[PDB]
Amino acid sequence: QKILQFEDILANTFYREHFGMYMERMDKRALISFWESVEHLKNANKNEIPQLVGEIYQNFFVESKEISVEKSLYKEIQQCLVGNKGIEVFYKIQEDVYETLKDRYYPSFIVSDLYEKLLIKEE
C-alpha cells in the first residue's frame, strides 16, 4: 500500500543498501556513498571529525580533471574547507545530493525489481 518514504529508505540499513545496489546499476553509487559519509559525520565523535572530513574529500572530490582545479589549488581548497565552514559546505552538498537521489533516482527504484524486497508479504 503506502509508499516507503525516501527518508526511511536512507534511515534503514536494509532499505538503503538495496537502494545503493540500484545506484550501482546506474554507475552512480558514489552519490549514496557520499551522502552516507556526510551523515556518518553528523553522528561522529569530534576526535574523528577532522580525519573524516579529510577522507570525504579524498574519497569523492579527488577526481582528476583535465582542467585540474584540484591539483592547481589544493592548498587553497583546503583552507576554504577548514572548519565549521567545511562541514557546512559538505552539509549543503549532501542536501543537494539528497534531493537529486529523491527526485531523479528514487522513483525508478520503486518500479525496479529491488523495491519488492523491501515489502513484507503478509501471511
Numbering used by the authors: 447 to 569
The authors write:
Here we have also solved the structure of the human SNX25 RGS domain by X-ray crystallography in two crystal forms. The wildtype sequence of the RGS domain crystallises with a non-native disulfide bond formed by Cys526 between adjacent monomers in the crystal lattice which distorts the orientation of the helix α5. Here we have solved the crystal structure of the human SNX25 RGS domain, revealing a typical α-helical RGS fold. The structure predicted by AlphaFold2 is remarkably close to the SNX25 crystal structure, with an overall root-mean-squared-deviation (RMSD) of 0.8 Å over 107 Cα atoms. The predicted structures of the human SNX13 and SNX14 RGS domains from the AlphaFold2 database are generally similar to the experimental SNX25 RGS domain structure as expected, but with some notable differences. Overall, these comparisons confirm that the AlphaFold2 predictions of selected SNX-RGS domains are accurate models comparable to their known experimental structures, including the RGS domain of SNX25 for which no detailed structural information was available prior to this study.
One of the most highly conserved sub-families are the SNX proteins with regulator of G-protein signalling (RGS) domains or SNX-RGS proteins. Other well-characterised family members include Mdm1 from Saccharomyces cerevisiae and Snazarus (Snz) from Drosophila melanogaster. These proteins have relatively low sequence similarity across homologues and across species but share a conserved architecture with an N-terminal hydrophobic membrane anchor, and a central RGS domain and PX domain (except for SNX19 orthologues which lack the RGS domain). The N-terminal membrane anchor mediates localisation to the endoplasmic reticulum (ER), and the proteins typically localise to sites of new lipid droplet synthesis and can enhance membrane tethering of the ER to other membrane compartments via their PX domains including the vacuole in yeast, the plasma membrane in Drosophila and endolysosomal compartments in mammalian cells. The precise function of the SNX-RGS proteins is still unclear although their mutation or depletion has significant impacts on cellular physiology, particularly with respect to lipid homeostasis and endolysosomal function.
